[PDB]
Design a protein around this motif. Structure first.
Motif, short mmCIF file in Angstrom:
data_model
loop_
_atom_site.label_atom_id
_atom_site.label_comp_id
_atom_site.label_asym_id
_atom_site.label_seq_id
_atom_site.Cartn_x
_atom_site.Cartn_y
_atom_site.Cartn_z
N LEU A 288 -10.30 31.11 62.94
CA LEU A 288 -10.19 30.03 63.30
C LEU A 288 -8.05 29.69 63.53
N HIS A 289 -8.02 28.89 64.64
CA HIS A 289 -6.67 28.93 64.71
C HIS A 289 -6.15 27.41 64.35
N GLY A 290 -4.67 26.80 64.83
CA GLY A 290 -4.32 25.87 64.15
C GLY A 290 -4.32 24.94 65.04
N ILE A 291 -3.61 24.03 64.85
CA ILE A 291 -3.56 22.22 65.53
C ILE A 291 -2.81 22.28 66.39
N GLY A 292 -4.25 21.55 67.74
CA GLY A 292 -3.46 21.35 68.92
C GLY A 292 -4.26 22.49 69.34
N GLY A 293 -4.64 23.88 68.76
CA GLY A 293 -5.02 24.88 69.73
C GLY A 293 -5.95 25.00 70.37
N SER A 294 -6.26 25.98 70.23
CA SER A 294 -8.05 26.41 71.17
C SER A 294 -8.19 28.04 70.82
N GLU A 295 -9.42 28.54 70.62
CA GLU A 295 -9.76 29.59 70.52
C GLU A 295 -9.37 30.34 71.00
N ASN A 296 -8.71 30.70 72.12
CA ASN A 296 -7.69 31.35 72.91
C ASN A 296 -5.85 31.96 72.57
N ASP A 297 -6.18 31.08 71.00
CA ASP A 297 -5.21 31.35 70.54
C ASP A 297 -4.67 32.38 69.64
N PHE B 156 -6.39 35.30 71.07
CA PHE B 156 -6.28 36.77 72.13
C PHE B 156 -4.96 37.00 72.82
N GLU B 157 -5.34 36.30 74.11
CA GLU B 157 -3.47 36.64 75.08
C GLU B 157 -3.02 35.13 74.43
N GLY B 158 -3.28 34.41 73.25
CA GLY B 158 -2.84 32.88 73.37
C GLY B 158 -1.68 33.66 72.58
N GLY B 159 -1.46 34.48 72.08
CA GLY B 159 -0.51 35.43 70.65
C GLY B 159 -0.87 36.17 69.55
N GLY B 160 -1.85 35.82 68.99
CA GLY B 160 -2.65 37.11 68.13
C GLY B 160 -3.61 38.01 68.97
N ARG B 161 -3.77 38.15 69.65
CA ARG B 161 -4.14 39.75 69.81
C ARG B 161 -5.18 39.76 69.06
#
Ligand SMILES: [Pt+2]
Length: 255
Positions: free
Chosen positions: A58-67, A69-74
């Motif tokens: 699970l991602h954070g507030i205002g985030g998305s399911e992309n966070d 991955f390419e959103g920074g989590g990798r």
């Protein structure tokens, strides 16, 4: 031993390392009465002839399911590399959109509990080759997502045996609600409770109070503080790297 700081390159694409595929999916949710998006990481070699364990990340507030991955989590890269190093067995990682907003919704992040349990999990289990028991299901997340991991995981130990809250936010339930039985179920059924946070994170106090409760009530867990770590992926990535390995050791990918 673990947890520990990851080696340089743990989150970088490595030449020769088989890569899993990250696919975008959508599912109907009775919790929101709408079609909701999610991403699914299928390990390299994914085949319908074999069953896999699943981690709901699970991602954070205002985030998305992309966070994640390419959103920074990798997450896919981190998983790809761990599988290649023989540190973890392949597994499926699902990243949902944690704000289950809808008609007459008081709290979308709270409503997500019903979305995950009654819509997303059933969708994943009917569309991918996965085990459906608690011993093969894990849940983890960052910030608001870490709060939901605590909340959903600890109040549904019949569904999750591994829980990894990283930098859990204020939405984390009071200790009495997380352990209404004084921790009975947690001590006997929870295979891994991994709490991590950066010491410079303003929200450190929440995971801290859960940790203090677990110590006072003899509830086995791992509490790991990244010295000087902030509210960013330099804490969340190491958290995932460690959780994946510790959950694997705890039995998440047991045949
Ligand atoms: Pt919040």
């Amino acid at each position: 031993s673990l947890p520990t700081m990851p080696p340089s390159g743990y989150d970088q694409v490595r030449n020769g390392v088989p890569r899993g595929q990250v696919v975008n999916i959508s599912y109907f949710s009775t919790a929101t009465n709408s079609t909701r998006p999610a991403r699914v990481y299928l390990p390299p070699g994914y085949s319908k002839d074999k069953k896999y364990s699943v981690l709901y990340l699970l991602h954070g507030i205002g985030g998305s399911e992309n966070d994640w991955f390419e959103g920074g989590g990798r997450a896919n890269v981190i998983a790809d590399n761990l599988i290649a190093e023989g540190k973890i067995k392949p597994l499926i990682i699902v990243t949902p959109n944690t704000n289950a907003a809808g008609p007459g919704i008081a709290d979308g992040y709270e409503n997500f509990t019903k979305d995950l349990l009654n819509s997303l999990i059933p969708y994943i289990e009917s569309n991918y080759s996965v085990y459906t028991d608690r011993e093969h299901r894990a849940i983890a997340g960052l910030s608001m997502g870490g709060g939901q991991s605590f909340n959903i995981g600890l109040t549904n130990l019949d569904k999750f045996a591994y829980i990894g809250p990283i930098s859990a936010a204020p939405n984390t339930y009071p200790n009495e609600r997380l352990f209404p039985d004084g921790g009975k179920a947690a001590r006997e059924k929870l295979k891994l409770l991994f709490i991590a946070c950066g010491t410079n994170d303003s929200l450190i106090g929440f995971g801290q109070r859960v940790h203090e409760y677990c110590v006072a009530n003899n509830i086995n867990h791992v509490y790991w503080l990244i010295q000087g770590g902030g509210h960013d992926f330099n804490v969340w990535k190491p958290g995932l790297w460690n959780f994946l390995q510790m959950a694997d050791e705890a039995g998440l990918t047991r045949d």
